[PDB]
Design a protein around this ligand. Structure first.
Ligand code: HC4
Ligand code: HC4
Length: 105
């Protein structure tokens, strides 16, 4: 069914980093209101601590090459309590979009 039925955070991005979908579990981790963040740039506005070579830089390399499927640990710490997460970022398996899935670790 739903994006909002997943127990882990899920964000859909276009290749500019624009937020297309943002689920309730992700908001619960980060304190963001899903409705508020849709349409903003993930890397530059919502989540500036991800604007780093290993996160946004890896994303942009994958958009360019059309190849992206990586998992890594990260700490989210902008306008929230520092929170360790595991991130799975990938090019979608159909169409032309990208996903960032997140769980607490
Ligand atoms: C660093 O600035 C991380 C912030 C953040 C990560 C993930 C989100 O869904 C929202 C903000
Ligand atoms: C993308 O890398 C998808 C991975 C995935 C989807 C659902 C599963 O049960 C297992 C892997």
């Amino acid at each position: 069914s739903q994006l909002d039925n997943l127990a882990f955070g899920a964000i859909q991005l276009d290749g500019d980093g624009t937020i297309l979908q943002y689920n309730a579990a992700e908001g619960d981790i980060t304190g963001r209101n899903p409705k508020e963040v849709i349409g903003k740039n993930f890397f530059k506005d919502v989540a500036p601590c991800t604007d780093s070579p290993e996160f946004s830089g890896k994303f942009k390399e994958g958009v360019a090459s059309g190849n992206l499927n990586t998992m890594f640990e990260y700490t989210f710490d902008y306008q929230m309590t520092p929170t360790k997460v595991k991130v799975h970022m990938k090019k979608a398996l159909s169409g032309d979009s990208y996903w960032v899935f997140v769980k607490r670790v």
